[PDB]
């Protein structure tokens, strides 16, 4: 990650204020509402027929927390994202067959969910670094594909 100490530092401080059970739940949901075609990988969760269903389905809410808690691991391994997410890359590629493009969609929704929580606090300089970051976690997950 070509991340700056002033950057890294903004990413970190804002993260320490994040309710991960909420945000993770909220990010995964919208992914499934705004990019409905991603529902392809989560058929075994239940009804994903409506906005309120998706946000309501706890299998969603739960997978969301798992996902965000791992983003959380990567946010203290910023100088070596690749190594952190290797096992995860191979997994999503060898077993789950997920098209890395979905990773990017998750970032952008992510960034979006975050502007919404911290409102004013989610300044442009802060967004820029997360942008930098969520692309990093993407390439990290995409890099062992074959």
């Amino acid at each position: 990650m070509h991340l700056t100490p002033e950057e890294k530092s903004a990413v970190t401080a804002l993260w320490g204020k994040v309710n991960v059970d909420e945000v993770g739940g909220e990010a995964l949901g919208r992914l499934l509402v705004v990019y409905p075609w991603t529902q392809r990988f989560f058929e075994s969760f239940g009804d994903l027929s409506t906005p309120d269903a998706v946000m309501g389905n706890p299998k969603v809410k739960a997978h969301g927390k798992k996902v965000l808690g791992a983003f959380s691991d990567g946010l203290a391994h910023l100088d070596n994202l690749k190594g952190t997410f290797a096992t995860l890359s191979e997994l999503h590629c060898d077993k789950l067959a997920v098209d890395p493009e979905n990773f990017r969609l998750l970032g952008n929704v992510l960034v979006c969910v975050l502007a919404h929580h911290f409102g004013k606090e989610f300044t442009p300089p802060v967004q820029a670094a997360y942008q930098k970051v969520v692309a990093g976690v993407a390439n990290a997950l995409a890099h062992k594909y074959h």
């Binding site: 949901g29 919208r30 509402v33 705004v34 906005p51 998706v54 946000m55 952008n108 960034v111 979006c112 969910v113 502007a115 919404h116 911290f118 409102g119 004013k120 989610f122 442009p124 300089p125 967004q127 820029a128 942008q131």
Partner: protein, 141 residues
């Protein structure tokens, strides 16, 4: 394709922005230049410092254009025609940047309208901003 309830959504969401579509356009742009420096290549004639007057006005022009867009969600193409000729034959902005400007308007909207921004209003604004985008790049070649 915009569904009649996507139209009801855009209308409401944008109805709240009201007198602030300007404030908001100027923010969308700032974040776009900050988060995606490549977008700066289309404004070498601008001064892109924080609080620029250029970056201001442009924001109002851009936002103003979305206003006319919503009011005409049914016939966007015609309303945006002159805008689509302008970006097409003169400015000639590579179509990728529309995804960036668009993403930045959302982020912005969310940070300002915590309540209107449901996952449903979210899904529609996206669809809506992409329909503006298609229309402004449908005459490139």
């Amino acid at each position: 394709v915009l569904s009649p309830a996507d139209k009801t959504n855009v209308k409401a969401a944008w109805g709240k922005v009201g007198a602030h579509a300007g404030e908001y356009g100027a923010e969308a742009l700032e974040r776009m230049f900050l988060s995606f420096p490549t977008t700066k290549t289309y404004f070498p004639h601008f001064d892109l410092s924080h609080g620029s007057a250029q970056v201001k006005g442009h924001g109002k022009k851009v936002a103003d254009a979305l206003t006319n867009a919503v009011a005409h969600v049914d016939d966007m193409p015609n309303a945006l025609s002159a805008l689509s000729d302008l970006h097409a034959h003169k400015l000639r902005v590579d179509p990728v940047n529309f995804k960036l400007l668009s993403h930045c308007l959302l982020v912005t909207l969310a940070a300002h309208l915590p309540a209107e921004f449901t996952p449903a209003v979210h899904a529609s604004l996206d669809k809506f901003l992409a329909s503006v985008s298609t229309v402004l790049t449908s005459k490139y070649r």
